[PDB]
Amino acid sequence: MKPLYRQLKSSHYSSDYSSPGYLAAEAVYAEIGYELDTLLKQNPGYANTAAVRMSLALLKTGISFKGRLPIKKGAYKGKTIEPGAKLLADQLHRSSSFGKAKIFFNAPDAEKGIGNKKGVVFFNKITNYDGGHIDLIEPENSLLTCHSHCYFNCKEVWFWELS
């Protein structure tokens, strides 16, 4: 299956404090049975939580992929999380669930290509930001809004439309 935008959103923990769907990074990891501080010590990359948030949301709407972090607690125990944005984007890109992304190389193209659609967005090689960002995007007042944050100052914008 391919998830519905509304339900993927409902199942997605925003890292934006002012979002109705906000959840702190430590609670996200606690949910799947990890202490954030232990993980950061093992690999500081875990501070970038976008792919973990998206992974978990995808799982809850029934999309499974290979990942590299086993969930150790809760309903999804035994399933895997992909903590790397690029690696998650690659999964989606080859999945039959989503298919190939539309890939944009500048902000005008990205914005016109997304248009009034909604879906999954991946910001690749973001200026002054490490690890990329994968998120949900939709229109809001003729602008585009991301559930956590948009990073249009980047080298590539990948987009998968959802209904």
Residue numbers in the entry: 1 to 163
From the paper:
Established functional assays were utilized to examine the effect of mutating the catalytic cysteine (Cys50) of Ssp1 and Ssp2. Isomorphous crystal structures of Ssp1 (at 1.85 Å resolution) and the active-site Ssp1-C50A mutant (at 2.2 Å resolution) reveal the overall enzyme structure and details of the active site. The protein is a monomer in solution but crystallized with two molecules in the asymmetric unit, each consisting of residues 1–163. Furthermore, we can conclude that the Ssp–Rap interaction does not depend on the catalytic cysteine and that recognition of the Ssp effectors by the T6SS machinery is also independent of their enzymatic activity.
Some Gram-negative bacteria target their competitors by exploiting the type VI secretion system to extrude toxic effector proteins. To prevent self-harm, these bacteria also produce highly specific immunity proteins that neutralize these antagonistic effectors.
